[PDB]
Amino acid sequence: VDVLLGADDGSLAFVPSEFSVPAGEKIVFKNNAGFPHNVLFDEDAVPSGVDVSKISMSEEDLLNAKGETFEVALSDKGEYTFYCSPHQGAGMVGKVIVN
Numbered sequence: 001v002d003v004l005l006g007a008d009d010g011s012l013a014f015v016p017s018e019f020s021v022p023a024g025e026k027i028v029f030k031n032n033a034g035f036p037h038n039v040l041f042d043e044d045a046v047p048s049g050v051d052v053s054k055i056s057m058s059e060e061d062l063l064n065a066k067g068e069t070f071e072v073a074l075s076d077k078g079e080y081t082f083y084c085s086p087h088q089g090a091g092m093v094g095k096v097i098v099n
């Protein structure tokens with residue numbers, strides 16, 4: 001499934017902000033507008049047994065150009081919160097439900 005980083009109108013949103021995916025489907029975060037963005041998972045809001053380090057960009061690593069991607073596949077079922085490091089305080093956070 002593709003998730004845009006930044007709305008076309010410059011909003012600091014993942015698009016979609018919430019969605020479900022079957023376990024193991026590739027999620028393609030696609031840099032879109034209103035850079036820089038990156039994608040990390042919140043160690044306090046993922047299913048028990050998930051290691052966010054394996055599924056998160058390094059916080060120091062930013063996507064500054066349209067069409068860069070960050071790709072991840074989530075095998076454990078449950079709710080995960082992801083966020084953009086530079087924009088976390090501006091509400092650029094999302095939820096994926098893996099089913």
Ligand SMILES: [Cu+2]
Nearest residue numbers: 036037084087
């Ligand atoms: Cu961002």
